[PDB]
Design a protein around this ligand. Structure first.
Ligand SMILES: CC1=N[C@H](c2cn(S(=O)(=O)c3ccccc3Cl)c3ccc(C)cc23)CN1
Ligand SMILES: [Cl-]
Ligand SMILES: [Cl-]
Length: 224
């Protein structure tokens, strides 16, 4: 997170870190005791999933292994559309003041809506500096039409842009797969942006979660 702030204790109980061994690979977001949502580009054969702390690599935090991923079948490695994935935990997490699922969206929030994105990604770019504390950036949704002035044909119908005009505050490497929360619902998953990160008037690009309600619920079903 470029030009962010340390997230307030307890305000992000759904954030998880997806670790490759012990090292940060991506962010993700708890949606259920058994399920994490993240970007498709974050996929690995297995993960260690850190829950219930703002500190990355916290030795006191719960760590649950995960080895089953469920990408959206339309995910593209070329155009980056459908960059969304569910990951099933080996064991269920216990909920607490530090651990809680985010609320999945019922509707799509419109342009101009205030949001916050969180992650342990680098706070500088292109020289990287990885923080301990979970960082936050406050950003607003940008309409397609405005976002297309920057990204043109690269933007797909289910991508969602956010930033602040003339500000550097934004996502960066390691933030991938983390939550963009607006008006108390998950509206985005961190997907991509421009590199180097945190150039004013280069919006962050997210997967637009409200366009995948059916898929998320179907894929997670525990009954008929
Ligand atoms: C979908 C996908 N995201 C991955 C990636 C990460 N970066 S990034 O430089 O680290 C980045 C810059 C700005 C904001 C957020 C981020 Cl994560 C990208 C920049 C541009 C593009 C096409 C992809 C990525 C690789 N694949
Ligand atoms: Cl990939
Ligand atoms: Cl998959």
């Amino acid at each position: 997170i470029i030009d962010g702030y340390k997230c307030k204790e307890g305000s992000h109980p759904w954030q998880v870190a997806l670790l490759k061994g012990n090292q940060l690979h991506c962010g993700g977001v708890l949606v259920d005791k058994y399920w994490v949502l993240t970007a498709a580009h974050c996929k690995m054969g297995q993960y260690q999933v850190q829950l219930g702390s703002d500190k990355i690599g916290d030795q006191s935090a719960q760590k649950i292994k995960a080895t089953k991923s469920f990408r959206h079948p339309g995910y593209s490695t070329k155009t980056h559309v459908n960059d969304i994935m569910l990951v099933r935990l080996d064991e269920p997490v216990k909920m607490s003041s530090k651990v809680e699922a985010v609320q999945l969206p019922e509707h799509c929030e419109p342009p101009g809506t205030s949001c916050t994105v969180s992650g342990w990604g680098t706070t500088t770019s292109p020289d990287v500096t990885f923080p301990s504390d979970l960082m936050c950036s406050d950003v607003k949704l940008i309409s397609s039409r405005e976002c297309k002035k920057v990204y043109k044909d690269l933007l797909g119908k289910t991508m969602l842009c956010a930033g602040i005009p003339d500000s550097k505050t934004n996502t960066c490497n390691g933030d991938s797969g983390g939550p963009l929360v607006c008006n108390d619902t998950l509206q985005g998953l961190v997907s991509w942006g421009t590199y180097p990160c945190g150039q004013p008037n280069d919006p962050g690009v997210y997967t637009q979660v409200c366009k995948y309600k059916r898929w998320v619920m179907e894929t997670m079903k525990t009954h008929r």
